[PDB]
Amino acid sequence: GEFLATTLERIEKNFVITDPRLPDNPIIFASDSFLQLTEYSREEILGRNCRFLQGPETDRATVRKIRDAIDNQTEVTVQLINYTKSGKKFWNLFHLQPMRDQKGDVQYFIGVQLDGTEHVRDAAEREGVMLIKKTAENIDEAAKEL
Numbered sequence: 065g066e067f068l069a070t071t072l073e074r075i076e077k078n079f080v081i082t083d084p085r086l087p088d089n090p091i092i093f094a095s096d097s098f099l100q101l102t103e104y105s106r107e108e109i110l111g112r113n114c115r116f117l118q119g120p121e122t123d124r125a126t127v128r129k130i131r132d133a134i135d136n137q138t139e140v141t142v143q144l145i146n147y148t149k150s151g152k153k154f155w156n157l158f159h160l161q162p163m164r165d166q167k168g169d170v171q172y173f174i175g176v177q178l179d180g181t182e183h184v185r186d187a188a189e190r191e192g193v194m195l196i197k198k199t200a201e202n203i204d205e206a207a208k209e210l
């Protein structure tokens with residue numbers, strides 16, 4: 065009910081945008097597709113760090129890769145198990161990248177999720193990474209003047 069989707073959030077891809085200037089680098093935008101994937105309402109996740117997607121089978125070494133990328137303000141692509149609101153597991157081929165302003169300073173982080181039933185390799189991995197990187201570039205363009 066609360067927090068009607070902006071045009072940005074109706075882009076037909078799973079993504080979130082966080083603002084590292086708020087304590088705990090919380091979600092400020094979340095696509096309709098992301099909400100369908102994860103089963104949360106937008107009001108339930110705005111202002112929260114994305115770590116709520118993690119659960120018991122999530123590989124914590126992989127989460128550390130993401131933590132390190134955020135702290136060093138660089139991109140990363142990983143695969144990890146995430147959980148919906150109701151506890152359904154999915155593999156997440158995940159890409160993070162910072163969005164920089166006109167002075168090169170990081171203003172937001174963009175995260176793109178490609179959900180699947182399995183850890184992917186070879187062609188499926190390559191095509192997945194192609195898709196989430198292109199999507200991240202599209203969101204970078206969309207978010208530039210937010």
Ligand SMILES: Cc1cc2nc3c(=O)[nH]c(=O)nc-3n(C[C@H](O)[C@H](O)[C@H](O)COP(=O)(O)O)c2cc1C
Binds near residue numbers: 113117130131160
């Ligand atoms: C833009 C953005 C999107 C993120 N999306 C996911 C996600 O899809 N799945 C996930 O497990 N973590 C995601 N994270 C990572 C967590 O929010 C967090 O950075 C990670 O758990 C490491 O920090 P922590 O050790 O304090 O939990 C995302 C982070 C950011 C900045």
